[PDB]
Design a binder for this molecule. Structure first.
Ligand SMILES: CCN(Cc1cc(=O)n2c(C(=O)NC)c(C)sc2n1)c1ccc(F)cc1
Ligand SMILES: N[C@@H](CCC(=O)O)C(=O)O
Lengths: 276, 286
């Protein structure tokens, strides 16, 4: 009934805030982050941070509906999820190695992850999108500028934020594009939006739902998602749960109720809608 | 003896096209836009389309998005199947008999008549309480199909939010769109008008919008948006009120539920699902 639940920051899905100068106020839920004392010890401390966002509003709704309480924590070993020598890290990892009953955030459902964890029904449509400055000419991932980057002189500059579903999808389908992209690996989304706006990168390949949110909220509406916000290798954001979990049913039916009720379209109006 | 999967489906263009077998009982060799051969299965459905009539089962030619996807799920997971059409031509709703029962494909799946539903079956709370759905193989919504000339803002036109006789609108009886209006209070004045005019089939309502014997049709956009591209005399109005996805139906006991979703994801990821969409769903202009 009192479940360990992992999350990861990614505006607007999960937003971390520092606790008030005493406790967590408004729509915010408390969320602990284990912070190391130093980088040559395992000794650390659980800092009390304050979590909010679209997924946090889904989790807030789910505890009420499904009737559970939770101990919310932020993933420190990695990010979303990556298989390293057949050993999982990030949110996925936390659920696999029974450190979390479930993972709520901007976590992309994919076959690879569905072999190890059970996913709730999708709550946000996602996949791969291509953001450029308003004026770059790209048909999609299918572009010879991407498929064959050395056919063009000078070559096209494009990258992603590695160790996530996007990089796995590109590695899986386009081996030549992948090996080319690696030299343009971005630390995170903010670096890539700057590398884009400051002309240091010609296109940033990333998660559809985050790229679509970033376009709509762009200062001066210079950055855009190719097509009219076209998604390739279409998937969604799902709640990760342990294989054979008893919560799956209860969570799926609640999520399906929230879609039907209009409670989900409400969440999209509050958190995801943009200007541009 | 059998491990041969009973596959219930419905007729719904461009997902499942149903046509007669030839005189030898075989399927016509048809070729796609590309020039590649159209994959076709035999489907043992009835012939008398009339309600409360004797169902005489006859082999027919089944092909479309959902057939390509079934052939895929078959090859991939290694299983054999027999395709048959839903005896009552319905998707599935739960009706009062005290005791309640499901009609259409939903009834068929739950009764044992079918071991899996390969069709454009909308995922919803009602159905999901009783059956297991796969991860979606399509995300679409609901929209209004009208004759070119009929002017409507969308789902909130005065001719729809406040009904009459000058403007007659409806949906398909015993479907998810039926359930949708039947469970929402804000649409109570809409459903009470619509239940008076609801159609036994989508084909029938789309025909009635062609005949001008119907003014507007609230149905699945993947189907409606397609019919408009095929029939330039018909047009879709407004954006999408409500968004829903299609899933493969199975029983909660079915040991295929995992492997079905793993294939649907494999297919999305590797662009085969976009391939199917590019083949069937997105073609023609007006
Ligand atoms: C097109 C295939 N998809 C995308 C998809 C399906 C879907 O049903 N939903 C729902 C919804 O109506 N859920 C009840 C949302 C809300 S956003 C969303 N996106 C897909 C396919 C596989 C997958 F694992 C995830 C998404
Ligand atoms: N949401 C993605 C990370 C972002 C991306 O790879 O575009 C995941 O769960 O892997």
């Amino acid at each position: 009934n009192h479940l360990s639940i992992v999350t990861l920051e990614e505006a607007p899905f999960v937003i971390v805030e520092d606790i008030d100068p005493e406790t967590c106020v408004r729509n915010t839920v408390p969320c602990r982050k284990f912070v190391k004392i130093n980088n040559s010890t395992n000794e650390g401390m659980n800092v009390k941070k304050c979590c909010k966002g679209f997924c946090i509003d889904i989790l807030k709704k789910l505890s009420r509906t499904v009737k559970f309480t939770y101990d919310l924590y932020l993933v420190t070993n990695g990010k979303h999820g990556k298989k390293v020598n057949n050993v999982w890290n990030g949110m996925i990892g936390e659920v696999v190695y029974q450190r979390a009953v479930m993972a709520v955030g901007s976590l992309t459902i994919n076959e690879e992850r569905s072999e190890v964890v059970d996913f709730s029904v999708p709550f946000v449509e996602t996949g791969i999108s291509v953001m450029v400055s308003r004026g770059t000419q790209v048909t999609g991932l299918s572009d010879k500028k991407f498929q064959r980057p050395h056919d063009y002189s000078p070559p096209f500059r494009f990258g992603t934020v590695p160790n996530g579903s996007t990089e796995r999808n590109i590695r899986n389908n386009y081996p030549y594009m992948h090996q080319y992209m690696t030299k343009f690996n971005q630390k995170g989304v903010e670096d890539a939006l700057v590398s884009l706006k400051t002309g240091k990168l010609d296109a940033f390949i990333y998660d559809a739902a985050v790229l679509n949110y970033k376009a709509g909220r762009d200062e001066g509406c210079k950055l855009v998602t190719i097509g009219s916000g076209y998604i390739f290798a279409t998937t969604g954001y799902g709640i990760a749960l342990q294989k054979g979990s008893p919560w799956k049913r209860q969570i799926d039916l609640a999520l399906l109720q929230f879609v039907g009720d209009g409670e989900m379209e409400e969440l999209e109006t509050l958190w995801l809608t943009g200007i541009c | 003896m059998s491990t041969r999967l009973k596959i219930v489906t419905i007729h719904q263009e461009p997902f499942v096209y149903v046509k007669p077998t030839l005189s030898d009982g075989t399927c016509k060799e048809e070729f796609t836009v590309n020039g590649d051969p159209v994959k076709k299965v035999i489907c043992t459905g009835p012939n008398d389309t009339s309600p409360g009539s004797p169902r005489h089962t006859v082999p027919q030619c089944c092909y479309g998005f959902c057939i390509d996807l079934l052939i895929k799920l078959a090859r991939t997971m290694n299983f054999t199947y027999e395709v048959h059409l839903v005896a009552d031509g319905k998707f599935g709703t739960q009706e009062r008999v005290n005791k309640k029962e499901w009609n259409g494909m939903m009834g068929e799946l739950l009764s044992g008549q079918a071991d899996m539903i390969v069709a454009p079956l909308t995922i919803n709370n009602e159905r999901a309480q009783y059956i297991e759905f796969s991860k979606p193989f399509k995300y679409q919504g609901l929209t209004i199909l009208v004759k070119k000339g009929t002017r409507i803002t969308g789902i909130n036109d005065p001719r729809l939010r406040n009904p009459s006789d000058k403007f007659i609108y409806a949906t398909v009886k015993q479907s998810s769109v039926d359930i949708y209006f039947r469970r929402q209070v804000e649409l109570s004045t809409m459903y009470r008008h619509m239940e008076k005019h609801n159609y036994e089939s989508a084909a029938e309502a789309i025909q009635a919008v062609r005949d001008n014997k119907l003014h507007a049709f609230i149905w699945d956009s993947a189907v409606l948006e397609f019919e408009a591209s095929q029939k330039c005399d018909l047009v879709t109005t407004g954006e999408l009120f409500f968004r829903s996805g299609f899933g493969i139906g199975m029983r909660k006991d079915s040991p295929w539920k995992q492997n079905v979703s793993l294939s649907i994801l494999k297919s999305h990821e590797n662009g085969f699902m976009e391939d199917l969409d590019k083949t069937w769903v997105r073609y023609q202009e007006c």
